Amino acid sequence: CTLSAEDKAAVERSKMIDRNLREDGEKAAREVKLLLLGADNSGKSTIVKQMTGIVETHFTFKDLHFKMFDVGGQRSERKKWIHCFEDVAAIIFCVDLSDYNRMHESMKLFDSICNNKWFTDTSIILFLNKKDLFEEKIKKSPLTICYQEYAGSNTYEEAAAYIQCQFEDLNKRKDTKEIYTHFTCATDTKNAQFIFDAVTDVIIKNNLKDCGLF
């Protein structure tokens, strides 16, 4: 080499920094990122019992780390900060079944997020929170409160089926995404397991798509 001693020492320092960057990147690679969205009353803050900037939550279930980001605090225009979340595994959308106006702007937000120009290859885990409470409420009063055009009996089955069919029918990019809908019980113990299953399935689909086998 034509270097001096100090130049060689600087090169050695740079190599050490490169090694540290490699280890940190490989460590950060072993994680799953989720975009937690929904109304303020949806219950997103209590979605997983395992537990102003972006709201961040982290949990590990069955040897898999998950970082959920809530970005409802950011009240600026979403167009100029939504591209920072294009490289995430899935969008977890929580809907409040009981409240009617809440679920209405929940449909608005669902359509807005699903029809973005960035999230054209990402899927939604749709948690229909407040299942049985809204079931009793719909026993008391029909779904005509918000879904006025909808015609159905007072049974919970028809109303819940219509609501799920709606929330899946606002979707337009059905070619490269798939919604995973889950009726959320008050004491549901399958939430983390459901997220695990959905993440594994979508990662398998991602392998299939890059390898061209899908």
Partner 1 sequence: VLLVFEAKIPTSFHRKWWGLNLQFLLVFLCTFMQIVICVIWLYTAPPSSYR
Partner 2 sequence: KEIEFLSWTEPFGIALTLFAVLGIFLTAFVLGVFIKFRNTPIVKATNREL
Question: Which positions are annotated as active-site residues?
Answer: 74
Verify binding: residue 212, partner 2, rule CB under 8 A.
Answer: yes
Verify binding: residue 214, partner 2, rule CB under 8 A.
Answer: yes
Which element (helix H / strand E) includes 123? strand 123-129
Q: What six digits make up the tokens of 116? A: 């973005």
* Minimum CB distance to partner 1 smaller for 175 or for 210: 210
Closest approach of Cβ 18 to partner 1, in Å? 18
In sequence order, the β-bridge partners of residue 91 are: 35, 124
Could you please report the per-residue DSSP string of 53-115?
--EEEEEE-SS-EEEEEE-SS--S-GGGTGGGGSS-SEEEEEEESS-HHHHHHHHHHHHHHHT
| Residue 31 contact, options partner 1, partner 2, none, Cβ 5-8 Å cut-off depending on partner type | partner 1
Closest approach of Cβ 204 to partner 1, in Å? 7
Closest approach of Cβ 213 to partner 2, in Å? 6
Interface characters, 13-52, with partner 1 (x: CB under 8 A): ----------------xxxx--------------------
Reduced to 3 states (helix: H, G, I; strand: E, B; else coil), residue 27 is: helix
* Minimum CB distance to partner 2 smaller for 186 or for 204: 204
Neighbours of 70 (CB within 10 A): 19
